[PDB]
Design an enzyme around this catalytic site. Sequence first.
Site, mmCIF file in Angstrom:
data_model
loop_
_atom_site.group_PDB
_atom_site.id
_atom_site.type_symbol
_atom_site.label_atom_id
_atom_site.label_comp_id
_atom_site.label_asym_id
_atom_site.label_seq_id
_atom_site.Cartn_x
_atom_site.Cartn_y
_atom_site.Cartn_z
ATOM 1 N N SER D 135 0.843 -1.064 -0.038
ATOM 2 C CA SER D 135 0.066 -0.095 -0.075
ATOM 3 C C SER D 135 0.928 1.209 0.037
ATOM 4 C CB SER D 135 -0.847 -0.055 1.195
ATOM 5 O OG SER D 135 -1.469 1.383 1.279
ATOM 6 N N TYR D 148 -1.178 -0.900 10.819
ATOM 7 C CA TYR D 148 -1.050 -1.032 9.548
ATOM 8 C C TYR D 148 0.104 -0.400 8.491
ATOM 9 C CZ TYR D 148 -3.349 -1.075 4.604
ATOM 10 O OH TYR D 148 -3.770 -1.137 3.408
HETATM 11 N N1 LIG Z 1 -9.145 -0.482 -0.597
HETATM 12 C C1 LIG Z 1 -7.972 0.324 -0.533
HETATM 13 O O1 LIG Z 1 -8.013 1.557 -0.673
HETATM 14 C C2 LIG Z 1 -6.642 -0.308 -0.366
HETATM 15 C C3 LIG Z 1 -5.376 0.760 -0.513
HETATM 16 C C4 LIG Z 1 -4.188 0.226 -0.399
HETATM 17 C C5 LIG Z 1 -3.729 -0.973 -0.287
HETATM 18 N N2 LIG Z 1 -4.947 -1.886 -0.026
HETATM 19 C C6 LIG Z 1 -4.537 -3.413 0.228
HETATM 20 O O2 LIG Z 1 -5.241 -4.291 -0.605
HETATM 21 C C7 LIG Z 1 -5.436 -5.639 -0.112
HETATM 22 C C8 LIG Z 1 -6.996 -5.760 -0.151
HETATM 23 O O3 LIG Z 1 -7.859 -4.504 0.124
HETATM 24 P P1 LIG Z 1 -9.304 -4.382 0.394
HETATM 25 O O4 LIG Z 1 -9.642 -2.985 0.083
HETATM 26 O O5 LIG Z 1 -9.783 -5.345 -0.629
HETATM 27 O O6 LIG Z 1 -9.723 -4.927 1.806
HETATM 28 P P2 LIG Z 1 -10.708 -6.115 2.446
HETATM 29 O O7 LIG Z 1 -11.346 -5.535 3.728
HETATM 30 O O8 LIG Z 1 -11.787 -6.380 1.497
HETATM 31 O O9 LIG Z 1 -9.593 -7.337 2.706
HETATM 32 C C9 LIG Z 1 -9.162 -8.305 1.922
HETATM 33 C C10 LIG Z 1 -9.596 -9.865 2.218
HETATM 34 O O10 LIG Z 1 -8.766 -10.060 3.180
HETATM 35 C C11 LIG Z 1 -9.694 -11.153 4.132
HETATM 36 N N3 LIG Z 1 -8.932 -11.385 5.426
HETATM 37 C C12 LIG Z 1 -8.570 -10.533 6.291
HETATM 38 N N4 LIG Z 1 -8.014 -11.165 7.467
HETATM 39 C C13 LIG Z 1 -7.891 -12.630 7.118
HETATM 40 C C14 LIG Z 1 -7.484 -13.599 7.842
HETATM 41 N N5 LIG Z 1 -6.859 -13.697 8.867
HETATM 42 N N6 LIG Z 1 -7.884 -14.845 7.124
HETATM 43 C C15 LIG Z 1 -8.308 -14.514 5.803
HETATM 44 N N7 LIG Z 1 -8.714 -13.769 5.168
HETATM 45 C C16 LIG Z 1 -8.710 -12.472 5.810
HETATM 46 C C17 LIG Z 1 -10.845 -10.285 4.201
HETATM 47 O O11 LIG Z 1 -11.866 -11.145 4.553
HETATM 48 C C18 LIG Z 1 -11.127 -9.736 2.804
HETATM 49 O O12 LIG Z 1 -11.939 -10.311 1.820
HETATM 50 C C19 LIG Z 1 -4.880 -5.281 1.170
HETATM 51 O O13 LIG Z 1 -3.622 -6.055 1.275
HETATM 52 C C20 LIG Z 1 -5.092 -3.927 1.507
HETATM 53 O O14 LIG Z 1 -4.261 -3.593 2.686
HETATM 54 C C21 LIG Z 1 -6.103 -1.514 -0.191
#
Ligand SMILES: NC(=O)c1ccc[n+]([C@@H]2O[C@H](COP(=O)([O-])OP(=O)(O)OC[C@H]3O[C@@H](n4cnc5c(N)ncnc54)[C@H](O)[C@@H]3O)[C@@H](O)[C@H]2O)c1
Lengths: 248, 240, 240, 242
Positions: D135, D148
């Site tokens: 990220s 985070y």
């Molecule tokens: N959404 C954004 O703006 C953004 C920005 C930068 C980076 N990211 C990164 O992108 C990735 C996905 O983000 P997202 O927005 O889809 O978030 P999200 O909340 O949808 O999480 C991704 C998935 O991880 C699963 N998860 C979490 N803990 C878990 C565990 N212990 N075991 C199994 N599954 C688990 C969740 O159930 C979810 O379906 C992450 O690594 C996040 O840090 C997202």
Amino acid sequence: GLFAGKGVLVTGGARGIGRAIAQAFAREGALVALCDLRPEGKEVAEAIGGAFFQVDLEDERERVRFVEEAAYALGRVDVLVNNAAIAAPGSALTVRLPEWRRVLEVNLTAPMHLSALAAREMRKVGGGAIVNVASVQGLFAEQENAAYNASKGGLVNLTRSLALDLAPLRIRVNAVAPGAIATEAVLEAIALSPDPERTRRDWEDLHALRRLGKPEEVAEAVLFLASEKASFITGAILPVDGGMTASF
Amino acid sequence: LFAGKGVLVTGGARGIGRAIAQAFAREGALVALCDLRPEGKEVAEAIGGAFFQVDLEDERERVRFVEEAAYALGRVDVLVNNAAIAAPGSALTVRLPEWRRVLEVNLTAPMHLSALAAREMRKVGGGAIVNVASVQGLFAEQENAAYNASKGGLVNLTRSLALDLAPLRIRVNAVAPGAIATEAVLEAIATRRDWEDLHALRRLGKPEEVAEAVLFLASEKASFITGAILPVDGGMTASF
Amino acid sequence: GLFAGKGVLVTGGARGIGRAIAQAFAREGALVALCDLRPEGKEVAEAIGGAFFQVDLEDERERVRFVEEAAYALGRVDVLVNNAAIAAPGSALTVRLPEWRRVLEVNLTAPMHLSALAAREMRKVGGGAIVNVASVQGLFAEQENAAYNASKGGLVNLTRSLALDLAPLRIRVNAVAPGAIATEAVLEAIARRDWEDLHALRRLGKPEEVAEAVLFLASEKASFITGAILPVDGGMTASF
Amino acid sequence: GLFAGKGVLVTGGARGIGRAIAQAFAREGALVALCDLRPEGKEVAEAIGGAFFQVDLEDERERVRFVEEAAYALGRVDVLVNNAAIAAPGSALTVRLPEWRRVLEVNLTAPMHLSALAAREMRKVGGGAIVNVASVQGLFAEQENAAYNASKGGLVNLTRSLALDLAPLRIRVNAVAPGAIATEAVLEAIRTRRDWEDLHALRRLGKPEEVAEAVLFLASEKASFITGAILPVDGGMTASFM
Ligand SMILES: NC(=O)c1ccc[n+]([C@@H]2O[C@H](COP(=O)([O-])OP(=O)(O)OC[C@H]3O[C@@H](n4cnc5c(N)ncnc54)[C@H](O)[C@@H]3O)[C@@H](O)[C@H]2O)c1
Ligand SMILES: NC(=O)c1ccc[n+]([C@@H]2O[C@H](COP(=O)([O-])OP(=O)(O)OC[C@H]3O[C@@H](n4cnc5c(N)ncnc54)[C@H](O)[C@@H]3O)[C@@H](O)[C@H]2O)c1
Ligand SMILES: NC(=O)c1ccc[n+]([C@@H]2O[C@H](COP(=O)([O-])OP(=O)(O)OC[C@H]3O[C@@H](n4cnc5c(N)ncnc54)[C@H](O)[C@@H]3O)[C@@H](O)[C@H]2O)c1
Ligand SMILES: NC(=O)c1ccc[n+]([C@@H]2O[C@H](COP(=O)([O-])OP(=O)(O)OC[C@H]3O[C@@H](n4cnc5c(N)ncnc54)[C@H](O)[C@@H]3O)[C@@H](O)[C@H]2O)c1
């Protein structure tokens, strides 16, 4: 001096860079409290009229004790230097999970926790400064040193996080990123290699200055970042690597 | 810290440059500062140094400045490349002549002056050079192309100089200031809260605060520091 | 054809990485217009079915002529790849000022100017993409290569500036930062193992591998990518 | 397509970016195995014709079991995408130690462990590729999001470590650093819209699909000379502070 009457906490100050930092602060008039797993820390504190606490920073209870006892002993807390750290040899393919977690606990979780504990004491005197000893290995990686590279990488961004969240408390937070420094730990690593002479030459040549750094040189950078001379510097990562990261 | 050492400071008539000149003089250094602005004369008089009216865009003038400064001081131990200009506009609006002028003053001048100063520093066993870059050399901003490009070039030039001058025992580093309350800033405004809030410390930095970082990097206390870029931005670059 | 029917301008396409980039776009159905000072660019264009323009990018008038004539030949401009570059061996201590200025003109000023010229053509088609070929030597330096290090460093931050100012016209701007790539230019300088050992993959990269990264950044697949610097160095900048 | 017949493991594929990534790989002909603690991941697997595994990535035993069962189901492992992540609101002053440790376990330790497990499978087919979803908050920080920021920062350098150590096994390891992406989680959390959008030069939030495209590229042979790299997919956010 730049720290006359100021309370300064230094973790892992029994030897190497930590010891140099503790002595540098004492030379600037600070009341120093250092902790370490090594009993030799006692002598260091005696020589600088400071206080020594034998502490296992892996244990959250011990981290709490250190700040409490240090704060009471010094009467105040103005600066915290997170210097203690460990490593666990191996790439992700061979490092054991318990050892990996231990490195994260000591190298990343401990500095986070100690910063929060120290910050609450700094609030009593209107603010202060925290300096994290990271490494060029927190900005780049090396082979077979996964735990160390991951934890130091985390420490680098944690430094930015702490800088943002503690700014309201008038606490600046910065980090130094040393290149190869001639501490007991590094001299050991070199001396125990198959070809010590060659290894030393190679490590020296990783720097533009073509020599290893001295613990005192890292200490001067820490002192600067912890001082009021660096009043508009926070969230910064300062390499103290003789030019290493300026070229490949 | 610098008692009896010869220090050259470009653009020392006001703002950060003036603060840097004053800081070195406070520490006992023999300071030679140059600038296009005549006020540099009063700065030199107040700190007990020497002033040289020089147009850094001209290569002949740059050679003359170092020669005259070296003669006046008797030695050269530190060079601070602080002078700089900007040309408002994106690549779509900036004119080529002004773009080239910004590159000449902000990038070519520091390269040239560093080479000239290095030759003098060799006479005293080495020294230190500090380049005043900017956070805008590590990142960009809207409609400020020439400045962003020249400062970005200055950042990597700092690394180049550090590598090539190490053998001469000359360390080279740069500071990357965030919003500092200088005449230039206290003019562009002439916004307030906006710029202040760009930093975690929620205030503009003072010229003196950048000067302290410059003095540190130019000192023996930074003996194992070279090729480094140090932000002095109140935490600006730590978060978006 | 990922770029079927799109107009693509490639500078320095006579050989090396530029040639590989031109070939890659042509393979994908693009109408390629490549320029170079070297005459062999003609055979490259003939082999891929594109257009060749012998141009000296140091000349601002020739840069204007190139974009105008290329746009006319292609019928539209969708992508510009700033690949042409030169170097001037030497540290700040030995490089000649005129040569230093020429490296800045070709490596930094030309990409700025061409991007502006190309952007006006891309407006006609609702936007486009620009990819600047920087270098790992734009993020770090090496000994005796000051002009190259400074200009590439400037190109890196210029990429950020362009990305910010051209976003309004729906033009994305990114850069690739290649490590040691097996081009004739590199093969000459060498005339090996050490250069290969600079990468984690322990080998020199192929021009075609840099081209693939360029095509990705120039494509709609990279629609939310702008102002980014992508190293294509086999892991070089991941460790010392 | 680019991944026809290739076995791909995607963590946290039940929703958001992970789901977009799984769909993208399937769209490219890959045999996809995704895991998530959320049971709805089953639906994603069915829609794309892949396999789903309910897994709690915080548990080392379940991580081992996941790679084993996924490898068995697919028949091979060519790509691993470490996408799953969690956060724990709060600065170092307010975050609880247990939640902080949990974030490090899921966001940093899990990717390390999974990369090792997946690499042993990749060795059977001559190598492969790993893509870590970091990220912009792994390169910079924000207020009250310490766990985070620290874990993602660690993941960024872990990516470099893995790239160096797995190169000999012909496994490339890179990371993408997304900016504000319009996932269901972000769309619900949302003036607020404009502010987040104005953080990027493109003045809009990114789509999960746009992050997926970058992941596909880095995991493909087109990126054969790219390893240990951190690629921002932030619409120009990290290009400027103003
Ligand atoms: N959404 C954004 O703006 C953004 C920005 C930068 C980076 N990211 C990164 O992108 C990735 C996905 O983000 P997202 O927005 O889809 O978030 P999200 O909340 O949808 O999480 C991704 C998935 O991880 C699963 N998860 C979490 N803990 C878990 C565990 N212990 N075991 C199994 N599954 C688990 C969740 O159930 C979810 O379906 C992450 O690594 C996040 O840090 C997202
Ligand atoms: N020496 C170098 O070249 C170098 C380079 C980069 C970064 N660093 C950093 O500088 C710091 C000090 O390095 P050093 O060379 O002096 O190493 P060192 O081995 O002397 O370690 C520092 C001190 O930490 C103490 N310590 C470790 N775990 C502890 C625990 N759980 N509780 C209490 N004390 C504990 C050790 O006993 C030691 O005295 C570290 O953070 C290291 O990562 C050193
Ligand atoms: N003020 C800020 O917020 C800020 C932020 C980042 C970087 N900086 C940098 O700090 C340095 C000083 O900034 P400042 O705010 O004091 O600006 P300033 O306007 O005061 O400029 C510095 C001095 O340079 C002199 N100068 C310019 N061109 C010259 C030439 N051709 N010959 C001789 N002298 C010349 C000017 O006359 C001036 O006195 C610059 O390098 C600037 O880019 C400033
Ligand atoms: N080869 C590498 O290892 C490497 C590594 C990093 C970055 N790069 C970059 O990749 C690009 C291409 O590198 P290359 O190895 O193929 O080098 P190259 O020598 O082939 O140079 C690129 C082309 O630019 C043309 N050119 C130079 N000045 C020109 C001018 N004024 N007008 C018109 N054409 C001109 C040259 O004739 C040449 O064909 C450059 O921007 C270079 O800096 C290369």
